[PDB]
PDB file of C-alpha atoms and ligand atoms in Angstrom:
ATOM      1  CA  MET A   1     -63.850  30.340  14.622  1.00 26.42           C
ATOM      2  CA  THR A   2     -66.651  29.376  17.195  1.00 31.03           C
ATOM      3  CA  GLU A   3     -70.220  29.834  15.905  1.00 32.83           C
ATOM      4  CA  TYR A   4     -73.103  29.995  17.314  1.00 31.21           C
ATOM      5  CA  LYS A   5     -76.212  29.155  15.151  1.00 29.31           C
ATOM      6  CA  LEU A   6     -79.494  30.891  17.128  1.00 26.61           C
ATOM      7  CA  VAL A   7     -83.138  31.270  15.753  1.00 27.87           C
ATOM      8  CA  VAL A   8     -85.430  34.123  16.391  1.00 28.16           C
ATOM      9  CA  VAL A   9     -89.024  33.053  16.430  1.00 30.08           C
ATOM     10  CA  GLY A  10     -92.283  34.539  17.899  1.00 30.16           C
ATOM     11  CA  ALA A  11     -95.768  35.647  17.208  1.00 32.41           C
ATOM     12  CA  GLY A  12     -96.177  38.386  14.016  1.00 29.91           C
ATOM     13  CA  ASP A  13     -94.774  41.880  14.518  1.00 28.45           C
ATOM     14  CA  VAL A  14     -93.444  41.171  18.035  1.00 28.34           C
ATOM     15  CA  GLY A  15     -89.639  42.999  16.834  1.00 31.23           C
ATOM     16  CA  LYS A  16     -87.547  39.405  15.683  1.00 28.78           C
ATOM     17  CA  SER A  17     -86.978  41.534  12.899  1.00 28.55           C
ATOM     18  CA  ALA A  18     -85.857  44.291  14.558  1.00 30.08           C
ATOM     19  CA  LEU A  19     -84.345  43.027  17.516  1.00 27.22           C
ATOM     20  CA  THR A  20     -81.974  41.148  14.904  1.00 25.76           C
ATOM     21  CA  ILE A  21     -80.796  44.081  13.156  1.00 23.77           C
ATOM     22  CA  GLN A  22     -80.630  45.692  16.267  1.00 28.78           C
ATOM     23  CA  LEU A  23     -77.771  43.218  17.084  1.00 30.72           C
ATOM     24  CA  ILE A  24     -75.952  43.141  13.060  1.00 30.84           C
ATOM     25  CA  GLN A  25     -76.237  46.789  12.775  1.00 27.33           C
ATOM     26  CA  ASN A  26     -77.165  48.402  15.962  1.00 30.32           C
ATOM     27  CA  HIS A  27     -79.976  50.209  13.499  1.00 31.53           C
ATOM     28  CA  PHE A  28     -83.785  50.635  15.263  1.00 31.05           C
ATOM     29  CA  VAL A  29     -85.411  49.276  12.265  1.00 32.11           C
ATOM     30  CA  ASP A  30     -88.994  51.715  12.294  1.00 30.75           C
ATOM     31  CA  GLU A  31     -90.818  51.416   8.789  1.00 30.45           C
ATOM     32  CA  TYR A  32     -88.617  49.118   6.427  1.00 25.64           C
ATOM     33  CA  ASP A  33     -88.836  45.420   8.008  1.00 26.87           C
ATOM     34  CA  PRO A  34     -87.607  42.571   5.942  1.00 24.76           C
ATOM     35  CA  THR A  35     -90.067  40.834   6.138  1.00 24.84           C
ATOM     36  CA  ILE A  36     -88.445  37.927   3.578  1.00 23.19           C
ATOM     37  CA  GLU A  37     -86.547  36.072   6.030  1.00 23.84           C
ATOM     38  CA  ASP A  38     -82.858  35.693   6.320  1.00 22.54           C
ATOM     39  CA  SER A  39     -79.783  34.682   7.766  1.00 18.91           C
ATOM     40  CA  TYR A  40     -77.194  37.133   9.241  1.00 18.81           C
ATOM     41  CA  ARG A  41     -74.011  36.824  10.424  1.00 17.74           C
ATOM     42  CA  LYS A  42     -71.369  39.103  12.935  1.00 18.01           C
ATOM     43  CA  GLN A  43     -68.331  38.099  15.109  1.00 14.33           C
ATOM     44  CA  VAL A  44     -69.027  39.485  18.479  1.00 15.31           C
ATOM     45  CA  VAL A  45     -67.249  38.913  21.647  1.00 14.23           C
ATOM     46  CA  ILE A  46     -69.227  37.122  24.253  1.00 15.64           C
ATOM     47  CA  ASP A  47     -68.025  36.843  27.675  1.00 14.94           C
ATOM     48  CA  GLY A  48     -64.444  37.049  26.812  1.00 14.50           C
ATOM     49  CA  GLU A  49     -64.633  35.076  24.025  1.00 15.10           C
ATOM     50  CA  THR A  50     -64.361  35.633  20.035  1.00 15.90           C
ATOM     51  CA  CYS A  51     -67.046  33.923  18.354  1.00 15.96           C
ATOM     52  CA  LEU A  52     -69.015  34.273  15.373  1.00 14.53           C
ATOM     53  CA  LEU A  53     -73.359  34.942  15.130  1.00 14.25           C
ATOM     54  CA  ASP A  54     -75.069  33.444  12.897  1.00 13.98           C
ATOM     55  CA  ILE A  55     -78.687  34.561  13.423  1.00 13.19           C
ATOM     56  CA  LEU A  56     -81.765  33.181  11.603  1.00 10.10           C
ATOM     57  CA  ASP A  57     -85.004  35.328  11.359  1.00  8.24           C
ATOM     58  CA  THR A  58     -88.092  33.679  11.122  1.00 10.27           C
ATOM     59  CA  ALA A  59     -91.554  34.523  10.121  1.00  9.90           C
ATOM     60  CA  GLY A  60     -94.270  34.951  12.812  1.00  7.02           C
ATOM     61  CA  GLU A  61     -97.508  26.988  10.827  1.00  5.98           C
ATOM     62  CA  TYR A  62     -96.262  23.909   9.883  1.00  9.55           C
ATOM     63  CA  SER A  63     -93.475  23.124   7.253  1.00  8.96           C
ATOM     64  CA  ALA A  64     -90.971  20.766   6.196  1.00 11.54           C
ATOM     65  CA  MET A  65     -88.434  23.197   4.888  1.00 10.80           C
ATOM     66  CA  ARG A  66     -88.811  25.395   7.826  1.00  9.41           C
ATOM     67  CA  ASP A  67     -88.107  22.591  10.150  1.00  6.10           C
ATOM     68  CA  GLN A  68     -85.120  22.276   8.357  1.00  8.29           C
ATOM     69  CA  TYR A  69     -84.196  25.574   8.829  1.00 10.69           C
ATOM     70  CA  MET A  70     -84.919  25.200  12.468  1.00  9.26           C
ATOM     71  CA  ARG A  71     -83.388  22.393  12.929  1.00  8.00           C
ATOM     72  CA  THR A  72     -80.104  23.996  12.344  1.00  6.49           C
ATOM     73  CA  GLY A  73     -80.616  26.219  15.704  1.00  6.40           C
ATOM     74  CA  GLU A  74     -78.605  25.675  18.301  1.00  6.11           C
ATOM     75  CA  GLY A  75     -80.472  27.684  20.506  1.00  8.48           C
ATOM     76  CA  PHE A  76     -83.603  29.683  20.612  1.00  6.25           C
ATOM     77  CA  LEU A  77     -85.206  33.145  21.290  1.00  3.63           C
ATOM     78  CA  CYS A  78     -88.933  33.001  22.198  1.00  2.00           C
ATOM     79  CA  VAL A  79     -90.230  36.570  21.337  1.00  2.00           C
ATOM     80  CA  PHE A  80     -93.119  38.100  22.588  1.00  2.00           C
ATOM     81  CA  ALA A  81     -94.241  41.994  22.904  1.00  2.00           C
ATOM     82  CA  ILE A  82     -95.379  43.273  25.737  1.00  2.00           C
ATOM     83  CA  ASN A  83     -98.253  45.147  24.862  1.00  2.00           C
ATOM     84  CA  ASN A  84     -99.476  42.135  22.928  1.00  2.00           C
ATOM     85  CA  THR A  85    -101.080  39.808  25.189  1.00  2.00           C
ATOM     86  CA  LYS A  86    -101.633  36.849  22.322  1.00  2.00           C
ATOM     87  CA  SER A  87     -97.729  37.256  21.252  1.00  2.00           C
ATOM     88  CA  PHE A  88     -97.719  36.608  24.723  1.00  2.00           C
ATOM     89  CA  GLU A  89     -99.863  33.316  24.309  1.00  2.00           C
ATOM     90  CA  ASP A  90     -98.592  32.140  21.437  1.00  2.00           C
ATOM     91  CA  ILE A  91     -95.108  31.543  23.217  1.00  2.00           C
ATOM     92  CA  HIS A  92     -95.671  27.820  23.601  1.00  2.00           C
ATOM     93  CA  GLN A  93     -96.757  26.779  20.416  1.00  2.00           C
ATOM     94  CA  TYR A  94     -93.521  28.112  19.160  1.00  3.48           C
ATOM     95  CA  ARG A  95     -91.497  26.369  22.319  1.00  3.99           C
ATOM     96  CA  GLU A  96     -93.695  22.857  21.121  1.00  4.17           C
ATOM     97  CA  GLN A  97     -92.408  23.350  17.406  1.00  4.40           C
ATOM     98  CA  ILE A  98     -88.653  23.615  18.672  1.00  2.00           C
ATOM     99  CA  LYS A  99     -88.951  21.066  20.964  1.00  2.00           C
ATOM    100  CA  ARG A 100     -90.571  18.543  18.565  1.00  2.31           C
ATOM    101  CA  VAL A 101     -87.906  19.757  15.688  1.00  4.67           C
ATOM    102  CA  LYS A 102     -84.575  19.194  17.558  1.00  7.63           C
ATOM    103  CA  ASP A 103     -86.006  15.936  19.257  1.00 10.37           C
ATOM    104  CA  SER A 104     -85.394  17.015  22.839  1.00 12.39           C
ATOM    105  CA  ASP A 105     -87.309  18.931  25.721  1.00 13.08           C
ATOM    106  CA  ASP A 106     -84.182  20.467  26.746  1.00 12.40           C
ATOM    107  CA  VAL A 107     -83.118  23.255  24.571  1.00 14.08           C
ATOM    108  CA  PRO A 108     -81.084  25.931  24.791  1.00 13.94           C
ATOM    109  CA  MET A 109     -84.021  28.988  24.704  1.00 15.92           C
ATOM    110  CA  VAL A 110     -84.647  32.292  26.329  1.00 13.66           C
ATOM    111  CA  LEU A 111     -87.401  33.878  26.569  1.00 13.96           C
ATOM    112  CA  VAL A 112     -87.762  37.683  25.553  1.00  9.67           C
ATOM    113  CA  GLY A 113     -90.431  40.571  26.314  1.00 11.50           C
ATOM    114  CA  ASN A 114     -89.605  42.518  23.740  1.00 13.53           C
ATOM    115  CA  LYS A 115     -91.041  46.518  23.300  1.00 17.73           C
ATOM    116  CA  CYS A 116     -90.056  47.219  27.041  1.00 21.08           C
ATOM    117  CA  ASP A 117     -89.501  50.704  26.283  1.00 17.85           C
ATOM    118  CA  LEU A 118     -93.683  50.528  26.098  1.00 15.95           C
ATOM    119  CA  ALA A 119     -94.345  51.616  30.000  1.00 18.03           C
ATOM    120  CA  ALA A 120     -98.093  50.248  28.658  1.00 19.26           C
ATOM    121  CA  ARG A 121     -97.667  46.946  29.165  1.00 21.88           C
ATOM    122  CA  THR A 122    -100.588  44.223  28.841  1.00 20.41           C
ATOM    123  CA  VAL A 123     -97.826  41.389  29.938  1.00 23.66           C
ATOM    124  CA  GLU A 124     -96.463  42.263  33.568  1.00 23.06           C
ATOM    125  CA  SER A 125     -92.692  41.114  33.961  1.00 23.18           C
ATOM    126  CA  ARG A 126     -94.285  38.759  37.080  1.00 25.24           C
ATOM    127  CA  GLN A 127     -95.771  36.781  34.392  1.00 26.17           C
ATOM    128  CA  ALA A 128     -92.991  35.764  32.242  1.00 27.43           C
ATOM    129  CA  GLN A 129     -90.988  34.750  35.493  1.00 23.01           C
ATOM    130  CA  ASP A 130     -93.480  32.697  36.014  1.00 22.82           C
ATOM    131  CA  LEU A 131     -93.758  30.975  32.325  1.00 23.11           C
ATOM    132  CA  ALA A 132     -90.111  31.034  32.081  1.00 20.54           C
ATOM    133  CA  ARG A 133     -89.750  29.477  34.990  1.00 18.60           C
ATOM    134  CA  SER A 134     -91.693  26.714  34.713  1.00 16.74           C
ATOM    135  CA  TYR A 135     -89.949  26.284  31.401  1.00 16.39           C
ATOM    136  CA  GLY A 136     -86.439  25.989  32.994  1.00 15.62           C
ATOM    137  CA  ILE A 137     -85.106  28.633  31.108  1.00 18.07           C
ATOM    138  CA  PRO A 138     -84.077  32.567  31.233  1.00 18.35           C
ATOM    139  CA  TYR A 139     -86.149  35.709  31.299  1.00 17.95           C
ATOM    140  CA  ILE A 140     -85.116  38.820  29.579  1.00 14.20           C
ATOM    141  CA  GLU A 141     -86.566  42.261  28.883  1.00 12.66           C
ATOM    142  CA  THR A 142     -85.375  44.165  25.861  1.00 11.77           C
ATOM    143  CA  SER A 143     -86.236  47.154  23.359  1.00 13.88           C
ATOM    144  CA  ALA A 144     -84.811  46.749  19.658  1.00 16.60           C
ATOM    145  CA  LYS A 145     -85.754  50.547  20.042  1.00 18.20           C
ATOM    146  CA  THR A 146     -83.498  52.056  22.716  1.00 18.28           C
ATOM    147  CA  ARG A 147     -81.302  48.944  22.269  1.00 18.72           C
ATOM    148  CA  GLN A 148     -82.153  48.013  25.727  1.00 17.62           C
ATOM    149  CA  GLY A 149     -81.188  44.267  26.308  1.00 18.50           C
ATOM    150  CA  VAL A 150     -80.837  43.100  22.853  1.00 19.21           C
ATOM    151  CA  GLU A 151     -77.170  41.697  23.091  1.00 22.80           C
ATOM    152  CA  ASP A 152     -77.982  40.636  26.752  1.00 22.27           C
ATOM    153  CA  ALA A 153     -80.800  38.560  24.929  1.00 19.27           C
ATOM    154  CA  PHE A 154     -78.630  37.032  22.359  1.00 18.55           C
ATOM    155  CA  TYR A 155     -75.278  36.446  24.442  1.00 19.80           C
ATOM    156  CA  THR A 156     -77.591  34.646  27.467  1.00 20.61           C
ATOM    157  CA  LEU A 157     -78.900  32.541  24.837  1.00 18.56           C
ATOM    158  CA  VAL A 158     -74.879  31.852  23.703  1.00 20.54           C
ATOM    159  CA  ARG A 159     -74.783  30.955  27.882  1.00 18.15           C
ATOM    160  CA  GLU A 160     -77.582  28.999  27.526  1.00 16.35           C
ATOM    161  CA  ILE A 161     -75.518  27.113  24.679  1.00 15.96           C
ATOM    162  CA  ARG A 162     -72.500  26.583  26.127  1.00 15.49           C
ATOM    163  CA  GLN A 163     -73.717  24.960  29.298  1.00 16.21           C
ATOM    164  CA  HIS A 164     -76.014  22.960  27.794  1.00 17.53           C
TER     165      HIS A 164
HETATM  166  N1  GNP B   1     -91.581  50.778  20.703  1.00 16.52           N
HETATM  167  C1  GNP B   1     -90.681  49.425  19.849  1.00 16.52           C
HETATM  168  N2  GNP B   1     -91.239  49.123  19.125  1.00 16.52           N
HETATM  169  C2  GNP B   1     -90.891  47.944  18.390  1.00 16.52           C
HETATM  170  C3  GNP B   1     -89.890  47.338  18.966  1.00 16.52           C
HETATM  171  N3  GNP B   1     -89.641  45.943  18.702  1.00 16.52           N
HETATM  172  C4  GNP B   1     -90.234  46.742  17.275  1.00 16.52           C
HETATM  173  N4  GNP B   1     -90.855  47.177  16.924  1.00 16.52           N
HETATM  174  C5  GNP B   1     -91.690  47.777  15.973  1.00 16.52           C
HETATM  175  O1  GNP B   1     -92.880  46.883  16.110  1.00 16.52           O
HETATM  176  C6  GNP B   1     -92.538  46.652  14.628  1.00 16.52           C
HETATM  177  C7  GNP B   1     -92.714  44.897  14.003  1.00 16.52           C
HETATM  178  O2  GNP B   1     -91.551  44.366  13.989  1.00 16.52           O
HETATM  179  P1  GNP B   1     -90.845  43.476  13.330  1.00 16.52           P
HETATM  180  O3  GNP B   1     -89.288  43.502  13.717  1.00 16.52           O
HETATM  181  O4  GNP B   1     -90.677  43.732  11.835  1.00 16.52           O
HETATM  182  O5  GNP B   1     -91.862  42.084  14.120  1.00 16.52           O
HETATM  183  P2  GNP B   1     -91.501  40.701  13.484  1.00 16.52           P
HETATM  184  O6  GNP B   1     -91.581  40.174  14.754  1.00 16.52           O
HETATM  185  O7  GNP B   1     -90.016  40.865  12.387  1.00 16.52           O
HETATM  186  N5  GNP B   1     -92.690  40.563  12.365  1.00 16.52           N
HETATM  187  P3  GNP B   1     -93.188  39.728  11.432  1.00 16.52           P
HETATM  188  O8  GNP B   1     -93.456  38.437  11.869  1.00 16.52           O
HETATM  189  O9  GNP B   1     -94.571  40.527   9.879  1.00 16.52           O
HETATM  190  O10 GNP B   1     -91.859  39.204  10.464  1.00 16.52           O
HETATM  191  C8  GNP B   1     -92.096  47.887  13.587  1.00 16.52           C
HETATM  192  O11 GNP B   1     -92.577  48.828  13.356  1.00 16.52           O
HETATM  193  C9  GNP B   1     -91.324  47.911  14.661  1.00 16.52           C
HETATM  194  O12 GNP B   1     -90.574  48.824  14.818  1.00 16.52           O
HETATM  195  C10 GNP B   1     -89.475  47.677  20.201  1.00 16.52           C
HETATM  196  O13 GNP B   1     -88.926  47.001  21.359  1.00 16.52           O
HETATM  197  N6  GNP B   1     -90.270  49.091  20.824  1.00 16.52           N
HETATM  198 CA1   CA B   2     -71.426  25.799  17.040  1.00 18.20          CA
HETATM  199 MG1   MG B   3     -89.577  39.529  11.022  1.00 22.49          MG
END
């Protein structure tokens, strides 16, 4: 079956595990986050295509084994939290790590501004749109809490993989 291997990266506590578990289990993780990084699989229909997603949840430095885990990704979600400025600034470092590991400057990737249920945001949508457009990648706002945008972010990443 058609399989899309996706990897979720970004700074601590931006919601990588929460986005992943929302996609897989439709559940919002409140207190019990996996903390230990794992791989999750699910058969979904994306734009009429039945396919399998394998999602690797990553930890929020450099490791040869982490490169080995990341090298298997076909596409990447770079997640920040819209109420945490440092996590947005950190996006540059995660994108640099992907480019190195994939040996490419055009890796299928989506910028994810998570926690968009929080109207008390420190990163404005316009700033993230600017950054995304300068990278040449989509930008999607998500909430793992309300589930808004969650499937949109993963499926848009699949679309980027398809057209690469
Ligand atoms: N309000 C709100 N809280 C969220 C959202 N996503 C995650 N959270 C909360 O943010 C905290 C961090 O989430 P978590 O999934 O553990 O993030 P992480 O990026 O996996 N952290 P780590 O880097 O330590 O693995 C949790 O308490 C979670 O409930 C969201 O969209 N909205
Ligand atoms: Ca594949
Ligand atoms: Mg986590």
